[PDB]
Amino acid sequence: EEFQQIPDFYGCYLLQSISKRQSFYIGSTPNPVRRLRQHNGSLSRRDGTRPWEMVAIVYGFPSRIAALQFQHAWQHGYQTRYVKTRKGGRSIHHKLAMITSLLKNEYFRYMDLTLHFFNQKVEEIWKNDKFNVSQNNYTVSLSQDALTEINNDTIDDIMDVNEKNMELVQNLYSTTLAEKTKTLLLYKEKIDTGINTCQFCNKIINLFAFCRDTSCTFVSHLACAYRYFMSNEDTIIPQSPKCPKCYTLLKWCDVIYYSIKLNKDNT
């Protein structure tokens, strides 16, 4: 209906088999923790494909549909270079080239997505950009205590990677939700308390826009913020929206997420 929200979490992930390093899987899900557990099932109930390491996830999608299409393109879409080139290949290099293609050279560039690595070696192969996909505007993060050059010579090695990788995926998922919860609760507090006017149109406010900095005093109509942001390359989405009060670089999709969510939760 007219109250559908941007998902709290929706990501597109790459799995790499811990023992079979040239085996990959691309999927998408609103709960990576649960999904990775299904993917691995039980190692006791076998060719060694399982267990999988989730090595990277792209998240922040405005909906399931847009995540599905990122997934489709990742799996079977074409690479580009700053024009179109060869279809996505088999190696880790090709899998990671497609990410760069989609985020940097494709319309996805405008969605303020986050690319997160759970494996540092996979992060560096990506940063490498072997095929020179690109010579902003997404986020790249790497897990604290990310895995480095994986050992898989032994059973204990393999079970260790699996185990640490779970913890790492769990930490990103729970922190993200918790950070969203905290930020939401403080925006609600701001609305329930003050009778604040929009910074721009000065009319007592129905969708809201706040700063990321939850102690900052910037508040406005969502459509007013957009107008200001489009005023001071971008034609239809503000790609580097600085807050007019603190100048912290905002993510416009983030601002919409809380706007939509705060509106939804009320009703």
Added chain:
Amino acid sequence: EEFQQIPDFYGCYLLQSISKRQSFYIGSTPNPVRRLRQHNGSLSRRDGTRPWEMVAIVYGFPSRIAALQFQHAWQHGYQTRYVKTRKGGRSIHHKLAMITSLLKNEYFRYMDLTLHFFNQKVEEIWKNDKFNVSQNNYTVSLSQDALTEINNDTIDDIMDVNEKNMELVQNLYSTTLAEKTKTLLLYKEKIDTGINTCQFCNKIINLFAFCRDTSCTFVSHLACAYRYFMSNEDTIIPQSPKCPKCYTLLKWCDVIYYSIKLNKDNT
């Protein structure tokens, strides 16, 4: 969750005041009929802005969020030309230039949107493209019995336009839903009956793809269809997917809509 659907209907509309021809309003809604009625309220409970004629609607959006952003950009986004130019102006020409900008020159081009006119004079001013926004890939339709050059010299004139415009908006809305319902029911019938294999991978099928032509026999995994479609300019969305069985030009977003919906309704 993982069962969110592409909306049965979600559109971005332009209103033009019947009496005040230079007054416009841009909005978006999953139910244009209900929304237009709210916009007009009652003419008995006044400056003559009301009643509004809904002159055009863009629909087919994958979600509320994407419709919201089309709306934002329409209202306050920049025009382009085949580079960026002047911000959207006040005239009917400028309002309609922004549509062309968004559909033809912007990422929206890939969403298989439909631009529908309820007013033929507004359609022709749009087709005119006074500012030469563009020298595929959306649909343009015009209401059967669309209004031509509006009379608003009198009360009866004005109430007549209002009245006919309602009927016209109602006919597009109800037909669209009914056409979607019919097409869905026949795809369900196809699944409940046959034990069909995918046309491409030959494995007995979890998302489906069918032809628009509901009597056509093409069926496949959604991801398989996408792969085929990306094989035979487009880098990540198949812009002219011809069915492999009948060669009718498909809309990929339409195919996803029924795919997602058929999957959703089952569970």
